[PDB]
Write a protein that binds this ligand. Structure first.
Ligand SMILES: [Ca+2]
Lengths: 353, 726
């Protein structure tokens, strides 16, 4: 609605690509208000011809947990005017007791969003294999979740998967130490890398050995491109059920944090820290909420970096590959040169849809 | 035809490729041995329904519907490979294959059951990979007398193997990432011929008692086995054992005295309460490492009878209490790190000698260290990183073989560092324990509140590495040894020391200057990029300029040293004494003028802007990023332990200057609270071309953004270079 967001949106219009790009997506929805933002901006981009979502994959749960996650994702897509994307369940991966306890997370607000319990598909990456084999052009792969199914897809038919893929975009981390053979290994601290370390190592090694370009996004890109809270109110002002859902979940998470930080329950954090990275005694939250300006969006920046059309507009990838190796580059906090236009794109292509 | 190799399909474009393998075409064959389909199907396939009964060598990819033709009885085969899917029920059963040897099925994603093996023998390679729905292996497979390579990889649904393995010469047995198994099969005979036994990420319950045979492997590595709870005593017949990441073990097998050979013991991420208290019977150990066990409260009894152990490593023993005490002569390595609960060390160690490696790292609750240390004249490395030891033990001057001495204290970062009650007003004047020493190479002191220094430092020799890090309340350094290559000093007195000692000291390579204010300004992680308080740089920007102005320049004489002059200081901007500044492009390229030798040209002075990171920065950013959402629960925080991290790190960068090849490396200290700070780094290399300086092919974290460059000259260091570029 603001003139500058319309101007940057028409600039992006003028910077359109000639052919839409079909992307394969792996997500773990209903854990944070981020993946729903990614879905919304992907839909809005598809309506503009930039991209075209084909299939999605759910992860981070047990059989029933992942079934429910896929059901909710299908419901969100159906109510987002996207009745084409196929929802597919993942495959089982090893879990520890602590890991199982923390991966059984399921917020109650998403219970109503689940669609009819028959449209879900519980096969896996079997459908994606056929489309990848018979696709007349090249596809890109975006990973913002666990790497299990992604590792499974690239472990078979190396020639096929290297001849019909463009690049891989992942939100994760890079271990500072080089591999024994000079390759680049994922670190153990990143959440996506820590979901399944073996699958992450296999993905990185296979991608670097198969010649597929690799796109890696750190966690500080959102720090450089934080969003004001008026974005949530703007999207939810019109009574959209999805926007209401994200507003509710963000409010719930923020007030849970604000109550937890009181009475020093969480070690290493105090009231001073909250006012540092979220603002610039202990009152009610209803007065704390207006004075926040630095909320974070992590995975949408990965989707933005995946598309080469908008990659050059605001990012600046830094090469890190050895002279003899597959092209791999990392985008961090220093590579984002125009955070203002980044926030403008998030607000624009999330508000319109 | 006798041979058919189907090439790529993008060469005919009429359908001849489907015709060749069509049923009506193979009638004319009447003789065929090899049939390979090395091309993956593009979008289309034609089911095959003949399969002539004469093949010997067959490779198929993306096979048609489930079953083979019911009339396929080749009665002779050698090699079968399938990379396809939906091939369930290969045969109806009881198929007589006489000569068949090699069977490979890869990524068959729905194979529900293998065929029967009642007749077929001589099967040398059996490979099954990525079989997602497979819950049975037809235990008749274990009755083959000649099996060489059994591969079972990424078997998601695998449940049971054959109960008995009768093979006498098995070389490769791989069970990878199954994580759903129930029991390892029990073997009967001895496999003298065996090369690889892979058992990775398997949900086994416990090994059987027949593992002694597999003692022909002499190694046993277990990783991420998250289901087993007990192990047999037969595992003690292995030379190397490495057990890691077992969330629930609870116990270790009792030692039965059957095995007397074992030297490698590595234990990580395991719940072991105590050792079996009978470790002495092994009497062959050389290396024992216990790393980060949450419940290791009691270690063992009479562990000191292992017949002269060599390497003892105890890391992150958060609950391991006071050691039993020595009642050994080949002990080199003793490492204890981050042992919080330990309160004291046994005294009788001062009987023990020939040690040479003693490390006490980050043990906060240890104060009264052993004091006598009589006849301990063999130590070489002594590390003391934790608090508690306020005063060094007396009679420490008796030993004269120490070479590495580390002494670090932990403080609180703020506007001004405050010592612990000013070291309890310790008598700093009488500190002479380190002065009485001799032949010390590395000497590190940090966080110690001493005002005076020993006056006998001239007697001490070969002190190559000297660190005094955050040591305030100090007025001056009395006298320095003439052989200090690396010096780390605080900014409070830094300008005087370099211009006072570089001219005198012949070998002074690297000087690092540390300031607490620049350290504590970046206490928060966001401060590196979000914004910067301008005046702070003006606090130290002229500091670098005056320091550069006060430098003795006599490096143009004969080469006394093979090294160059290296200075590391805080800051993030050019000190403006450089006449050639480059904002960006993370690279340098200067087209210097020519005919420099009108006056003698001392050398090129180069400056770089970088920033060093603590080794644990990823944890903090990930933690606070997760905090941005905070989907945690109250019960989660009741038992959350912060992962122990070293409070001091040494971070280094490498640069190369090309025009002769010269490459040199930088280094400085980084604190735990302040993960990353920006630093100015100056290098001077004494001596048609284009000056170039790239950082390195690697250096993932380190880029550098600002550069400077001048030409210095003779005539009392005029520096009046005829260079006009920017
Ligand atoms: Ca996510």
């Amino acid at each position: 609605l603001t003139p500058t967001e319309t101007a940057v949106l028409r600039e992006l219009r003028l910077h359109r690509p000639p052919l839409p790009l079909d992307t394969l997506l792996f997500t773990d929805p209903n854990k944070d208000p981020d993946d729903v933002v990614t879905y919304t901006i992907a839909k809005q981009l598809q309506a503009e011809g930039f991209l075209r979502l084909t299939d999605v994959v759910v992860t981070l749960g047990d059989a029933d947990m992942r079934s429910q996650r896929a059901q909710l994702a299908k419901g969100v897509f159906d109510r987002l005017a996207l009745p084409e994307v196929r929802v597919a369940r993942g495959q089982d991966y090893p879990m520890t007791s602590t890991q199982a306890r923390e991966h059984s997370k399921f917020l109650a607000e998403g219970a109503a969003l689940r669609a009819a319990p028959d449209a879900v598909h519980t096969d896996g990456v079997r459908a994606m294999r056929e489309r990848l084999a018979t696709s007349p052009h090249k596809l890109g792969m975006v990973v913002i979740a666990g790497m299990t199914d992604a590792s499974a897809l690239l472990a078979e038919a190396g020639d096929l998967v290297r001849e019909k893929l463009a690049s891989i975009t992942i939100m994760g981390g890079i271990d500072p130490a080089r591999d024994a053979d000079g390759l680049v290994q994922p670190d153990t601290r990143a959440y996506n890398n820590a979901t399944d370390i073996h699958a992450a190592r296999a993905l990185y090694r296979r991608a670097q050995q198969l010649g597929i370009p690799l796109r890696i996004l750190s966690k500080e890109a959102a720090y450089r491109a934080a969003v004001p809270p008026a974005f949530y109110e703007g999207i939810a002002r019109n009574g959209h059920p999805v926007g209401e859902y994200l507003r509710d979940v963000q409010k719930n998470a923020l007030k849970g944090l604000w109550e937890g930080i009181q009475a020093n329950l969480i070690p290493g954090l105090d009231t001073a820290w909250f006012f540092r990275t979220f603002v610039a005694g202990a009152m009610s939250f209803d007065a704390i909420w207006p004075q926040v300006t630095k909320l974070n969006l992590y995975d949408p920046l990965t989707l933005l970096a995946a598309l080469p059309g908008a990659a050059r507009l605001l990012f600046q990838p830094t090469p890190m590959h050895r002279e003899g190796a597959s092209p791999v580059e990392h985008v961090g906090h220093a590579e984002v040169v125009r955070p203002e236009k980044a926030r403008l794109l998030l607000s624009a292509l999330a508000k319109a849809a | 035809i006798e041979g058919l190799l189907l090439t790529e399909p993008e060469q005919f474009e009429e359908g001849e490729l489907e015709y060749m393998y069509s049923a009506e075409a193979l009638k004319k064959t009447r003789r065929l041995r090899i049939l390979v389909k090395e091309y993956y199907n593009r979008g289309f396939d034609e089911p095959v329904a003949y399969l002539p009964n004469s093949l010997l060598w067959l490779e198929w990819r993306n096979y048609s519907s489930n079953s083979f033709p019911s009339n396929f009885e080749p009665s002779k085969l050698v090699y079968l490979t399938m990379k396809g899917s939906s091939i369930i029920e290969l045969w109806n059963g009881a198929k007589r294959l006489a000569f068949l040897t090699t069977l490979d099925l890869s990524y068959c994603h729905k194979l529900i059951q293998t065929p029967d093996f009642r007749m077929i023998t001589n099967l040398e390679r059996l490979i099954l990979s990525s079989c997602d729905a497979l819950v049975e292996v037809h235990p008749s497979v274990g009755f083959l007398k000649n099996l060489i390579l059994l591969n079972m990889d990424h078997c998601i649904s695998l449940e049971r193997l054959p109960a008995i393995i009768q093979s006498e010469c098995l070389e490769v047995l791989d069970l990878n990432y199954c994580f759903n198994l129930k029991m390892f099969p029990e073997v009967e005979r001895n496999m003298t011929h065996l090369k690889k036994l892979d058992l990775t990420s398997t949900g086994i319950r416990e090994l059987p008692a027949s593992i002694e045979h597999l003692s022909s492997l002499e190694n046993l590595q277990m990783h991420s086995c998250n289901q087993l709870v007990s192990l047999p005593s037969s595992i003690w017949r292995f030379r190397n054992l490495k057990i890691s990441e077992c969330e629930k073990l609870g116990s270790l097998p009792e030692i039965h005295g059957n095995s007397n050979c074992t030297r490698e013991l590595i234990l990580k991420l395991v719940s072991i309460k105590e050792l079996p208290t009978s470790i002495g019977n092994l009497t062959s150990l050389n290396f024992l490492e216990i790393c980060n066990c949450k419940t290791i409260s009691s270690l063992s009894s009479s562990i000191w009878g292992l017949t002269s152990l060599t390497t003892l490593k105890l890391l992150d023993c958060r609950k391991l209490k006071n050691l039993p005490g020595i009642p050994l002569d080949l002990l080199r390595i003793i490492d204890m790190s981050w042992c919080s609960c330990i309160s004291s060390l046994p005294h009788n160690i001062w009987m023990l000698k020939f040690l040479r490696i003693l490390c006490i790292s980050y043990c906060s609750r240890l104060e009264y260290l052993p004091e006598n240390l009589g006849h301990l004249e063999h130590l070489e490395e002594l590390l003391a990183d934790g608090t508690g030891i306020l005063r060094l033990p007396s009679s420490v001057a008796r030993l004269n073989k120490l070479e590495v001495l580390s002494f670090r204290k932990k403080f609180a970062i703020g506007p001004k560092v405050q010592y612990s009650s000013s070291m309890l007003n310790l008598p700093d004047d009488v500190f002479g324990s380190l002065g009485s020493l001799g032949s010390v190479v590395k000497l590190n002191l940090s966080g110690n509140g001493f005002c005076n220094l020993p006056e006998t430092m001239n007697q001490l020799f070969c002190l190559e590495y000297l660190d005094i890090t955050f040591c305030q309340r100090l007025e001056a350094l009395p006298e320095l040894p003439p052989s200090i290559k690396e010096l780390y000093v605080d900014e409070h007195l830094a300008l005087r020391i370099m211009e006072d000692l570089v001219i005198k000291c012949k070998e002074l390579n690297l000087i690092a200057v540390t300031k607490i204010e620049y350290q504590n300004f970046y206490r928060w992680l966001d401060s590196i990029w979000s914004d910067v308080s301008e005046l702070l740089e003006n606090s130290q920007k002229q500091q670098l300029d005056d320091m550069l102005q006060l430098i003795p320049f006599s490096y143009l004489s004969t080469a006394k040293r093979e090294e160059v002059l290296k200075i590391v200081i805080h800051g993030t901007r050019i000190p403006e004494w450089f006449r050639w500044q480059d904002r960006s492009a993370t690279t340098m390229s200067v087209n210097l003028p020519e005919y420099w030798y009108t006056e003698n040209f001392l050398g090129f002075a180069i400056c770089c802007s970088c920033c060093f990171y603590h080794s644990a920065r990823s944890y903090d950013v990930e933690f606070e990023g997760s905090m941005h959402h905070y989907n945690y629960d109250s019960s989660y925080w009741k038992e959350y332990e912060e992962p122990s991290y070293d409070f001091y790190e040494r971070d280094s960068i490498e640069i190369t200057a090309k025009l002769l090849k010269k490459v040199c490396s930088f280094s400085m200290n980084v604190l735990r609270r302040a993960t990353a700070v920006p630093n100015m780094c100056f290098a001077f290399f004494p001596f048609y071309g284009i000056f170039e300086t790239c950082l390195s092919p690697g250096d993932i974290r380190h880029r550098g953004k600002q550069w400077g460059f001048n030409l210095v000259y003779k005539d009392e260091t005029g520096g009046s270079v005829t260079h006009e570029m920017l």
